[PDB]
RNA sequence: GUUUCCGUAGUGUAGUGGUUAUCACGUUCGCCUAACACGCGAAAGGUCCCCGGUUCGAAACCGGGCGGAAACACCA
RNA sequence: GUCUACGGCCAUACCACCCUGAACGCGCCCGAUCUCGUCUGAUCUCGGAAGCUAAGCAGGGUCGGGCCUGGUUAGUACUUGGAUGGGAGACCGCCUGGGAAUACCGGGUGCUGUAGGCUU
RNA sequence: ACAGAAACCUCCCGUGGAGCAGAAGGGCAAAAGCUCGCUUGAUCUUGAUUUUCAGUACGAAUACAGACCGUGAAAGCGGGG
RNA sequence: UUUAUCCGGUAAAGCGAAUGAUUAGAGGUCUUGGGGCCGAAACGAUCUCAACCUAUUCUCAAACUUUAAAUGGGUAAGAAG
């Protein structure tokens, strides 16, 4: 019997990196738009890199943060493609997790022969009531010792709701 | 020959001491200065506007002005003989109340008080200070010991 | 492994911030610029009206700043307002008015000025700005203190201000942030401040919610149902308050004496009592494993 | 090569550490300020024989080299190759200077005499105060004589004057020899290769829990 | 044709022989240097003093006859 | 010692202002030739001397150095 | 006893971890009718009040790191004046005064300013 | 995910190790670091002082005062950096 | 010359307090490596050397400093109070 340590999803982050700019990026923005239903933020280059074809302050990726129920509704319909199974080393040291997909169509999406197939990074920030203590402005603070989601609490999170196997071996 | 620049040799004066790098505690500009009050200059890095300068870092002078956030202050500065009583316009941050005067004031308040009293007696009280006299004949006593014998101790080479 | 960031060195060199910083409560730079009084004044104070909307209760108080610790001359909270016929919804912009109004009048009862610079009475929601009367005690003034509230248009803070201005303090306030300013035009409606002052925000939420769905009413505001408060009524609770406050602002306290006075913290352990616990162990340990 | 040590025997100048400020320093002659069985233990190797300066002087890097070597040669013989440690405790380190030799050709014509007098880096030297150690050695308690004389020969690569002294500490620790066996047997002191950790009645109790366990 | 490039040698001797006079400070030093808005004002204070002398004189004689009465009531 | 100047493909040498690198020669492969030359088509090849700094970035802009070069070293 | 609001001096206050929260507040919380702010009501604004001290905070704990004192090192190092002191010289000795710092041992762990609660 | 010592994202730590056109030097954090909105306080005008000192200039600075303004809910802050 | 009171960053010290150098061992697949040697290969065994860092230790800094003297520099010790 726990009061409100309802381990629950604070956010779902969708990034679509594509070291290009212009088209091949601008189209990727419509995928997140379509999938989420919110205008995604264009990221840009921290600084220039030569082997890559990217330049400081050039646009590269496009990314979103999805939250509330519509996070649940894209995590579910996310893993599904990864048939409710992940690996041991994605359950991270701070109680977050991450599962990437290969192709954006597999999430109930229509392919246009123009708008190709850019998968995406899904990651999710598990939280808990009273995790906004840090992020607020007045009377900020830190989140206890417990109240911090350990790797192994984030594991049997994912194992008792999406009921995945979480297969070992790296 | 060296550079005349206003802040030479200040590398390690104006430098704030330790673990005080930051917000200037507010008290230090919410105590009141007023003309006649004697004040010790003490330059400070943090604020650079209205700085004094090294040739009077650590001097004292009386105040002759008071502007919105600064204090015009008359200080004596020695210069190949002729000392010059001269006036500068230092921002509050670099200034304190010297407690120099404040032994006297407490000595005055006591003497006027001790003179008004013991006037109804007419007994003459020792008002002036007086330097530390020679320590008076006292006795000592050991009780039931002789004193302890010292010997200088034999040198051996430690390393 | 990694390098341990938090060495001995981390803590030999870590220089604390500056207490009311750690707690995270105070612009001091900005307290600096608010508070410290010019030195063409030496003693005379600088008053600031302090408003921080908490979360349950709005606190407003006039303070002046001394070297031992800023002294509060007058303090008016929101949880007083039951006295003045306002039971509920008392961290709400319209109650910050009454609170700030209270404050202005609890102050102005002292230095005997409740008979002058009343400010606006019927309430409009405009420029009211007090003009000191000649041959009288000149009006009171203070430079509003927001604290840490991102002061966008509509926020309660500079709204409670409107209360203390309306109540007869001469604060420099502009109108650019009162709920009503149009940020694509640059005027008032002012008749939006009408509402915004008297809580027909809350009335019209108490009416969009009700006809759509029941039991979101009651959930969203139970105590707005309980205490037999309604819309329509609302406007004419508050108007009894900015009247009732103004006929009697003064605080009467409540006298206090009883407490038995038990000590139900926990105390500091004395030296010897730590001194043994290590000697108490190490005899619990030694004994335990001189065996198995 | 270099002027004779004479001319840079004495500390006149303020330390010139090799740094940003002087650069192009020829690498110090000496490189190993310890040899023998530096893989020793504290508990098997009990004789902190010392060589100590009696004068405020400078010692060249190249003297230290010789001083070391000639003590590695006599010890070995004496004890064998395994049967000591030698430590030099003056890594030369303020940098010494040379006006650039007043170079001229034949009869010559112009040197400029003194302009830009400031020299260049020549080498490196140690500062040495009185009663300060230069070299130290450890062996078995057995083998005192064979330390004595090894440092004795080293004195002769080496200007001024300096006493050979035998210490009161466990070999290379600071802990006064009359006292280890006790301080170890009860664990004020815990073995740590060459040296030893002094462990006090200070830290968390679970640190202790590991000992006396 | 080289030479000396300073010294501050006998010197102490000189700028000291005649003394080093700690500047002779009068009472009533000049108000030049002070913020004009002081003086702008304290001159209206100083100028309109005499306006208010009738009070001053009578109010003096009140205290003088009250303290002629205080010292005489002691007698 | 001090004052200049260079260093870039296997070699001789261009080149830019801070996005990019050449020529000729050499060489590898075909062709033509009975076979070599010559001629004609294809080709691959350096951290732009070693460095640290600045900068989006340096072969190129600073500072240090290392190798190769040049020029002075006048009154006695 | 204790808290809140505003505070002073800024670690005896920090940090790391362990323990407990009666009431009021202080918090966590619930939502987007409006104001307002976002990619996202994640932060700010606002309207609330269905839960729980999960954390902050507060209260406590650690032969806990740190900071703050004491001791010790040590009358050591260093130094004002002093000598027709020693010493080939480096340097060293004394006389008259002043007199540090580490390692190593101890103790402590924030004091209070105004306004207002609660324990009636 | 592709993604590798380096693209992109998210959590944690992060007293200051960045950053603050430059030599260093001093200064700096819900700043003086970074991002955006609004702009001309780089504006007009007397005087006082500091610094270089002879306590002469220039340059550079500090305090005030008078106008006219930007900014900000406002206190102030701002006469180049 | 005292007594108050500021000011002060040199000698010394420390560097198990920041920066900068630097010896040594215990310790650590931290990392990682590049070589071995035993291993097809295997954080497999054992070596080894790099680099890092966990407790340590040697020795230093004019263009370092937690500390930090001696000698020194302001004021003040009243009728102008
Ligand atoms: Mg602000
Ligand atoms: Mg919300
Ligand atoms: Mg709690
Ligand atoms: Mg709890
Ligand atoms: Mg401790
Ligand atoms: Mg003599
Ligand atoms: Mg700011
Ligand atoms: Mg002006
Ligand atoms: Mg100096």
């Amino acid at each position: 019997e726990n009061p409100m340590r309802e381990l629950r999803i604070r956010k779902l982050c969708l990034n679509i990196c594509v070291g290009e700019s212009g088209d091949r990026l601008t189209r990727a923005a419509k995928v997140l738009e379509q999938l989420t239903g919110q205008t995604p933020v264009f990221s840009k280059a921290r600084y220039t890199v030569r082997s890559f074809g990217i330049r400081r302050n050039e646009k590269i990726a496009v990314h979103c943060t999805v939250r509330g129920a519509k996070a649940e509704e894209i995590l579910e319909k996310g893993l599904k493609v990864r048939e409710y199974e992940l690996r041991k080393n994605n359950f991270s040291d701070t109680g977050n997790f991450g599962f990437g997909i290969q192709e954006h169509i597999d999430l109930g999406i229509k392919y246009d022969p123009s708008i190709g197939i850019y998968g995406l990074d899904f990651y999710v920030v598990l939280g808990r009531p009273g995790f906004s203590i840090a992020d607020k402005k007045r009377r900020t603070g830190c989140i206890g010792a417990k109240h911090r989601i350990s790797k192994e609490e984030a594991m049997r999170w994912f194992q008792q709701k999406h009921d995945g196997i979480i297969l070992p071996g790296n | 020959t060296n550079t005349k620049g206003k802040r030479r040799g200040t590398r390690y004066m104006f430098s704030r001491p330790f673990r005080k790098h930051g917000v200037v505690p507010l008290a230090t500009y919410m105590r009141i200065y007023k003309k006649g009050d004697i004040v010790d200059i003490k330059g400070m890095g943090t604020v650079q506007k209205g700085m004094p300068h090294k040739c009077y870092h650590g001097k004292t002078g009386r105040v002759y002005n008071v502007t919105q956030h600064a204090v015009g202050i008359v200080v004596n500065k020695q210069v190949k003989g002729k000392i010059l009583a001269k006036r500068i316009n230092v921002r509050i941050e670099h200034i304190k109340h010297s407690k120099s005067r404040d032994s006297f004031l407490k000595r005055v308040k006591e003497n006027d008080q001790k003179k008004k009293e013991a006037k109804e007696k007419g007994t003459w009280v020792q008002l002036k200070r007086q330097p530390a006299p020679p320590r008076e004949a006292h006795f000592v006593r050991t009780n039931g010991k002789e004193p302890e014998l010292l010997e200088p101790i034999p040198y051996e080479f430690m390393a | 492994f990694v390098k341990v960031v938090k060495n001995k060195a981390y803590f030999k060199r870590y220089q604390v911030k500056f207490r009311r910083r750690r707690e995270g409560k105070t612009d001091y730079y900005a307290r600096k610029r608010l508070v410290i009084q010019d030195k063409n004044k030496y003693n005379t104070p600088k008053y600031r009206m302090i408003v921080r909307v908490t979360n349950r209760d709005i606190i407003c108080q006039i303070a002046y700043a001394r070297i031992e610790g800023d002294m509060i001359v007058c303090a008016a909270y929101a949880h007083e307002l039951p006295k003045y016929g306002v039971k509920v919804g008392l961290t709400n912009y319209a109650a910050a008015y009454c609170t700030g109004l209270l404050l202005a009048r609890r102050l102005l009862n002292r230095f005997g000025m409740d008979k002058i610079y009343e400010g606006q009475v019927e309430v409009t929601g405009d420029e009211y700005n007090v003009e000191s009367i000649d041959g009288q005690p000149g009006a009171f003034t203070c430079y509003l203190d927001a604290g840490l509230a991102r002061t966008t248009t509509g926020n309660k803070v500079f709204g409670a201000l409107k209360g203390a201005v309306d109540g007869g303090l001469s604060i420099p306030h502009s109108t650019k942030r009162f709920p009503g300013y149009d940020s694509e035009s640059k005027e008032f409606n002012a008749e939006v401040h009408r509402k915004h002052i008297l809580g027909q925000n809350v009335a019209d939420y108490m009416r969009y919610l009700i006809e759509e769905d029941e039991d979101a009413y009651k959930k969203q505001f139970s105590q707005y149902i309980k205490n037999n408060v309604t819309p329509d009524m609302m406007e004419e609770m508050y108007k009894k308050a900015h009247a009732a406050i103004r006929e009697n602002p003064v605080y009467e306290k409540k006298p206090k004496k009883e407490v038995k006075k038990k000590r139900w913290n926990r105390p500091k352990m004395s030296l010897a009592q730590k001194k043994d616990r290590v000697a108490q162990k190490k005899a619990s340990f030694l004994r335990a494993q001189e065996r198995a | 090569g270099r002027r004779p040590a004479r001319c840079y025997r004495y500390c006149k100048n303020k330390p010139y550490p090799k740094s940003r400020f002087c650069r192009g320093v020829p690498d110090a002659k000496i490189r190993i300020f310890d040899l023998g069985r530096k893989k020793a233990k504290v508990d098997e190797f009990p004789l902190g024989g010392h060589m100590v300066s009696d004068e405020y002087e400078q010692l060249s890097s190249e003297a230290l080299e010789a001083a070391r070597i000639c003590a590695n040669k006599y010890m070995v013989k004496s004890c064998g190759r395994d049967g000591f440690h030698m430590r030099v405790r003056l890594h030369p380190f303020h940098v010494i200077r040379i006006n650039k030799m007043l170079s001229c050709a034949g009869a010559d014509r112009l040197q400029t005499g003194m302009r830009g007098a400031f020299g260049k880096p020549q080498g490196t030297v140690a500062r040495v105060h009185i009663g300060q150690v230069i070299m130290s050695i450890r062996t078995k308690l057995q083998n005192e004589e064979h330390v004595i004389e090894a440092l004795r020969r080293a004195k002769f690569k080496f200007p001024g004057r300096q006493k050979i002294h035998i210490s009161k500490k466990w070999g290379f620790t600071k802990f006064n020899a009359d006292e280890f066996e006790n301080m170890v047997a009860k664990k004020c002191l815990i073995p740590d290769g060459c040296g030893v950790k002094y462990v006090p009645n200070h830290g968390p109790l679970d640190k202790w829990r590991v000992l006396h366990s | 044709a080289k030479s000396k490039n300073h010294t501050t040698h006998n010197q102490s001797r000189k700028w000291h022989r005649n003394g080093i006079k700690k500047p002779r400070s009068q009472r009533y030093e000049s108000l030049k240097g002070v913020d004009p808005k002081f003086l702008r004002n304290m001159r209206f204070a100083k100028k309109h003093n005499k306006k208010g002398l009738k009070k001053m004189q009578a109010n003096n004689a009140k205290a003088m006859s009250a303290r002629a009465e205080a010292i005489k009531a002691l007698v």
Side-chain angles (χ1 to χ4, degrees), chain A, chain B, chain C residues 1-185 187-292, chain D, chain E:
Chain A
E1 79 311 331
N2 293 106
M4 52 190 270
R5 308 181 98 209
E6 282 279 65
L7 246 169
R8 67 207 201 124
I9 295 170
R10 243 201 296 197
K11 70 144 150 315
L12 166 68
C13 342
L14 320 193
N15 138 55
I16 306 198
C17 188
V18 39
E20 297 229 351
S21 205
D23 298 352
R24 280 294 331 258
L25 212 181
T26 46
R27 322 226 270 18
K30 298 164 170 285
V31 170
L32 297 173
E33 180 87 325
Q34 190 182 71
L35 180 53
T36 63
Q38 31 156 208
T39 53
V41 170
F42 285 128
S43 163
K44 45 159 51 59
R46 217 188 166 359
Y47 45 55
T48 300
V49 196
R50 300 220 82 267
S51 309
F52 289 55
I54 62 168
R55 339 218 288 233
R56 189 160 164 295
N57 296 27
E58 195 219 14
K59 300 189 166 175
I60 281 173
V62 57
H63 86 331
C64 248
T65 28
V66 199
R67 345 187 90 179
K70 196 145 60 64
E72 203 60 49
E73 256 279 72
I74 301 163
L75 206 217
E76 190 47 42
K77 195 254 253 67
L79 35 61
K80 167 72 82 75
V81 174
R82 321 259 40 249
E83 59 196 23
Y84 310 93
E85 58 169 320
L86 301 169
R87 299 176 127 276
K88 247 284 273 69
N89 25 238
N90 345 4
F91 302 93
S92 88
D93 271 45
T94 54
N96 301 258
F97 94 112
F99 80 98
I101 67 164
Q102 195 145 119
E103 47 195 298
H104 89 313
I105 52 253
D106 268 8
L107 318 178
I109 300 187
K110 303 286 287 187
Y111 110 183
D112 214 324
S114 57
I115 300 157
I117 307 172
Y118 351 127
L120 39 149
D121 216 52
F122 289 119
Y123 201 65
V124 164
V125 180
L126 298 181
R128 247 205 266 267
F131 252 115
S132 35
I133 284 167
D135 325 328
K136 72 201 283 217
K137 183 76 174 285
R138 181 213 256 112
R139 173 154 305 97
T140 67
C142 267
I143 306 92
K146 57 257 155 75
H147 231 204
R148 304 215 290 238
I149 304 154
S150 70
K151 178 170 191 333
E152 302 276 38
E153 211 190 298
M155 284 271 284
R156 50 136 251 79
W157 195 123
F158 158 69
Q159 222 172 4
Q160 175 240 110
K161 179 99 177 293
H162 302 283
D163 10 302
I165 71 194
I166 314 166
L167 65 103
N170 62 73
Chain B
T1 49
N2 284 231
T3 61
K4 273 69 140 286
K6 286 108 85 155
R7 262 188 56 180
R8 94 151 88 178
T10 49
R11 169 153 161 240
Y12 187 22
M13 272 180 29
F14 280 71
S15 58
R16 165 123 280 163
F18 234 3
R19 313 198 329 211
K20 284 165 216 309
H21 310 316
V23 180
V24 189
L26 293 178
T28 64
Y29 36 130
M30 55 195 295
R31 36 247 271 208
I32 86 294
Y33 293 140
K34 48 221 297 294
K35 72 98 189 182
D37 279 85
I38 302 157
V39 158
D40 20 11
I41 296 90
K42 185 202 174 172
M44 176 189 306
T46 46
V47 183
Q48 312 103 338
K49 277 189 121 60
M51 264 186 322
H53 126 39
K54 55 176 201 295
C55 61
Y56 351 39
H57 174 69
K59 268 63 200 294
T60 34
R62 80 187 193 288
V63 169
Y64 86 109
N65 246 12
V66 213
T67 57
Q68 288 157 16
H69 22 155
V71 172
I73 170 165
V74 180
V75 264
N76 303 305
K77 193 179 91 142
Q78 198 185 145
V79 199
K80 314 166 174 70
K82 64 191 169 54
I83 288 168
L84 297 168
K86 55 175 302 206
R87 11 186 69 162
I88 58 175
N89 270 351
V90 177
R91 172 150 286 168
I92 280 168
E93 279 86 302
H94 316 283
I95 263 177
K96 301 182 292 188
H97 277 352
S98 50
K99 297 190 296 308
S100 54
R101 168 82 95 268
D102 272 76
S103 45
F104 137 51
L105 291 183
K106 279 62 266 292
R107 198 179 33 54
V108 165
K109 191 173 302 314
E110 195 160 33
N111 296 332
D112 307 50
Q113 175 48 22
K114 290 165 60 265
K115 194 206 284 188
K116 253 114 76 190
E117 84 113 11
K119 197 77 196 298
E120 81 324 315
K121 297 185 97 295
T123 46
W124 195 62
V125 188
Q126 204 7 49
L127 303 155
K128 294 198 179 66
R129 268 152 43 213
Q130 188 203 321
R135 75 187 33 153
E136 259 261 43
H138 52 212
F139 279 118
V140 183
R141 53 145 161 238
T142 179
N143 337 51
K145 315 159 198 65
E146 72 169 38
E148 188 193 321
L149 187 29
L150 296 191
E151 317 254 313
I153 61 102
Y155 172 65
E156 53 66 33
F157 164 15
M158 288 265 68
Chain C
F1 283 158
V2 279
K3 173 162 209 169
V4 175
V5 180
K6 291 179 158 188
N7 246 309
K8 266 189 192 184
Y10 183 77
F11 309 92
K12 290 209 164 199
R13 293 293 327 284
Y14 176 62
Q15 178 267 355
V16 281
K17 288 279 207 192
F18 207 59
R19 206 190 19 68
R20 289 280 298 295
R21 176 84 255 294
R22 281 169 275 211
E23 275 111 54
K25 302 164 153 173
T26 318
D27 293 328
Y28 79 122
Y29 76 68
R31 239 209 88 207
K32 189 188 125 184
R33 270 76 85 10
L34 269 169
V35 165
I36 70 199
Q37 188 26 8
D38 275 358
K39 325 270 154 159
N40 351 0
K41 334 274 174 86
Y42 355 106
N43 245 173
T44 175
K46 204 175 181 177
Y47 301 131
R48 358 94 77 135
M49 201 227 308
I50 283 159
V51 184
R52 322 274 175 283
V53 171
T54 304
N55 176 356
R56 277 178 160 120
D57 148 64
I58 303 157
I59 307 157
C60 291
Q61 32 157 158
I62 279 82
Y64 105 166
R66 280 293 161 288
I67 197 172
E68 309 99 343
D70 45 326
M71 311 284 269
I72 316 309
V73 58
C74 190
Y77 302 46
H79 63 193
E80 323 213 320
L81 295 172
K83 266 262 199 173
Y84 303 80
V86 186
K87 297 289 122 63
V88 278
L90 39 63
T91 195
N92 125 147
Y93 147 64
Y97 182 175
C98 309
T99 309
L101 176 57
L102 226 186
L103 185 51
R105 317 281 0 208
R106 196 162 341 149
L107 191 70
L108 269 42
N109 85 247
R110 318 164 88 149
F111 347 114
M113 299 182 297
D114 251 297
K115 320 316 306 170
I116 3 160
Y117 8 109
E118 320 330 336
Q120 164 76 342
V121 171
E122 269 89 308
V123 189
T124 307
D126 277 3
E127 258 37 65
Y128 199 82
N129 28 81
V130 176
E131 290 163 39
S132 63
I133 293 177
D134 333 326
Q136 265 356 296
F140 182 94
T141 173
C142 47
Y143 323 100
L144 181 281
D145 172 334
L148 296 180
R150 169 70 301 291
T151 50
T152 58
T153 307
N155 123 149
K156 290 147 198 172
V157 169
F158 71 83
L161 163 63
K162 176 60 180 173
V165 171
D166 237 327
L169 307 195
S170 167
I171 300 100
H173 60 285
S174 202
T175 21
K176 199 217 161 186
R177 336 298 348 265
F178 300 159
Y181 182 89
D182 213 351
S183 198
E184 69 225 321
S185 301
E187 337 81 301
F188 282 130
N189 225 150
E191 233 79 293
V192 173
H193 215 38
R194 220 313 104 264
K195 313 309 177 181
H196 261 261
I197 269 165
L198 300 177
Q200 284 104 113
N201 349 342
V202 187
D204 269 289
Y205 180 9
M206 208 160 171
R207 310 212 225 167
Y208 157 59
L209 280 197
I210 179 176
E211 87 211 29
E212 205 258 297
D213 79 327
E214 216 87 62
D215 189 15
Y217 221 3
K218 205 150 185 144
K219 187 259 275 278
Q220 163 41 27
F221 55 156
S222 180
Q223 268 57 340
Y224 264 77
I225 288 170
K226 191 178 144 286
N227 322 33
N228 324 89
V229 182
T230 29
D232 327 71
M233 175 173 167
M234 275 219 201
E235 193 206 319
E236 305 262 36
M237 294 194 300
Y238 293 107
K239 285 189 181 185
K240 316 315 140 190
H242 341 110
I245 288 158
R246 262 153 61 228
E247 81 4 61
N248 170 262
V250 79
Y251 210 49
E252 104 253 310
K253 309 224 58 42
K254 39 278 225 307
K256 194 193 104 167
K257 210 297 300 178
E258 210 258 51
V259 181
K260 353 173 86 285
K261 258 282 288 187
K262 70 132 61 65
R263 196 221 158 29
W264 51 328
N265 197 311
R266 192 177 191 274
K268 194 91 79 177
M269 189 167 298
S270 97
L271 169 55
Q273 309 172 312
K274 306 190 275 283
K275 202 92 171 181
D276 44 3
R277 248 228 275 115
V278 303
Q280 282 277 340
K281 292 161 190 174
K282 49 183 292 165
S284 194
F285 175 140
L286 284 170
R287 187 268 282 96
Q289 86 129 95
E290 302 340 289
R291 220 102 107 310
Chain D
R2 48 185 245 154
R3 332 203 137 71
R6 280 189 296 206
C7 345
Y8 316 44
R9 173 157 160 203
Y10 282 123
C11 315
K12 268 80 92 69
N13 320 33
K14 294 186 188 78
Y16 219 164
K18 180 202 83 170
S19 60
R20 315 135 58 119
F21 299 86
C22 74
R23 47 172 40 138
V25 175
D27 235 284
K29 174 64 164 184
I30 197 176
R31 217 67 70 116
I32 310 161
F33 337 109
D34 39 358
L35 325 86
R37 260 189 55 223
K38 54 248 180 81
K39 206 124 289 178
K41 311 301 198 169
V42 221
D43 318 65
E44 49 107 356
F45 224 12
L47 207 273
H50 261 306
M51 188 219 270
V52 181
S53 185
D54 226 14
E55 323 184 323
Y56 191 90
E57 70 256 286
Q58 309 207 283
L59 289 172
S60 53
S61 58
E62 310 195 338
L64 292 159
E65 201 88 291
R68 171 201 55 200
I69 290 176
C70 91
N72 270 346
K73 212 55 46 60
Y74 185 77
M75 313 210 73
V76 188
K77 306 335 92 148
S78 280
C79 353
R81 191 174 294 232
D82 59 288
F84 67 51
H85 204 349
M86 287 160 45
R87 191 81 150 290
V88 179
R89 306 178 93 160
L90 285 182
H91 352 324
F93 193 7
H94 110 56
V95 172
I96 217 76
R97 276 188 312 259
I98 157 169
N99 62 169
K100 293 64 183 302
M101 37 276 177
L102 297 175
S103 178
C104 53
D108 180 0
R109 188 52 60 94
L110 66 183
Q111 190 285 346
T112 60
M114 214 63 178
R115 293 196 189 107
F118 200 170
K120 303 258 64 179
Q122 200 210 36
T124 30
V125 149
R127 290 265 115 73
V128 194
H129 326 329
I130 301 179
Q132 187 216 30
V133 173
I134 307 152
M135 292 183 58
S136 46
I137 307 193
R138 59 148 127 28
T139 80
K140 310 205 76 66
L141 222 158
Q142 249 277 298
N143 207 33
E144 171 172 273
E145 268 43 355
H146 297 268
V147 174
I148 277 174
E149 194 116 336
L151 296 173
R152 207 281 246 152
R153 287 162 193 257
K155 288 206 310 201
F156 281 52
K157 308 304 206 202
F158 234 37
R161 207 192 65 164
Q162 39 206 333
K163 296 108 71 212
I164 290 158
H165 181 232
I166 283 170
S167 208
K168 297 177 129 65
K169 318 297 197 161
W170 239 304
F172 276 43
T173 68
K174 72 190 92 177
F175 288 78
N176 148 233
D178 108 304
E179 203 62 354
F180 244 169
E181 327 311 37
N182 291 58
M183 286 195 105
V184 175
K186 70 132 172 288
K187 273 149 276 177
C188 259
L189 286 152
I190 295 165
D192 187 296
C194 279
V196 68
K197 286 197 221 300
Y198 180 79
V199 299
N201 302 15
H202 264 336
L205 208 69
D206 356 304
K207 190 64 264 144
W208 171 27
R209 286 209 175 99
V210 171
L211 299 328
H212 310 261
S213 69
Chain E
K2 304 211 303 178
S3 46
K4 199 103 168 157
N5 325 283
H6 261 198
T7 166
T8 318
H9 192 195
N10 38 48
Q11 328 268 143
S12 56
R13 283 161 157 206
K14 306 192 299 179
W15 21 298
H16 268 166
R17 260 141 164 207
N18 296 187
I20 299 192
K21 304 296 290 97
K22 298 214 73 260
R24 253 216 29 256
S25 281
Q26 264 85 124
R27 142 192 275 224
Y28 271 37
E29 105 269 69
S30 61
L31 306 179
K32 186 223 73 169
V34 177
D35 32 63
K37 200 160 74 188
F38 225 122
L39 304 172
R40 241 223 40 79
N41 162 215
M42 93 145 82
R43 284 141 93 346
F44 295 93
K46 215 168 278 179
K47 186 174 156 205
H48 308 283
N49 256 294
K50 60 94 204 301
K51 182 230 289 199
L53 179 60
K54 303 278 75 255
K55 285 165 179 173
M56 205 168 235
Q57 188 197 112
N59 172 229
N60 268 328
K62 290 289 98 196
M64 249 299 154
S65 289
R67 294 224 277 195
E69 280 292 346
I71 199 71
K72 210 80 169 67
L74 190 281
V75 172

